[PDB]
């Protein structure tokens, strides 16, 4: 897809804000 949304699965991966870190933009 992209790096920007990558990460936002990546952030979700790994609990998105279940985890604790902010959403990525």
Do not use: D, F, N, T
């Amino acid at each position: 897809e992209e790096e920007a949304v990558r990460l936002y699965i990546q952030w979700l991966k790994e609990g998105g804000p279940s985890s604790g870190r902010p959403p990525p933009s």
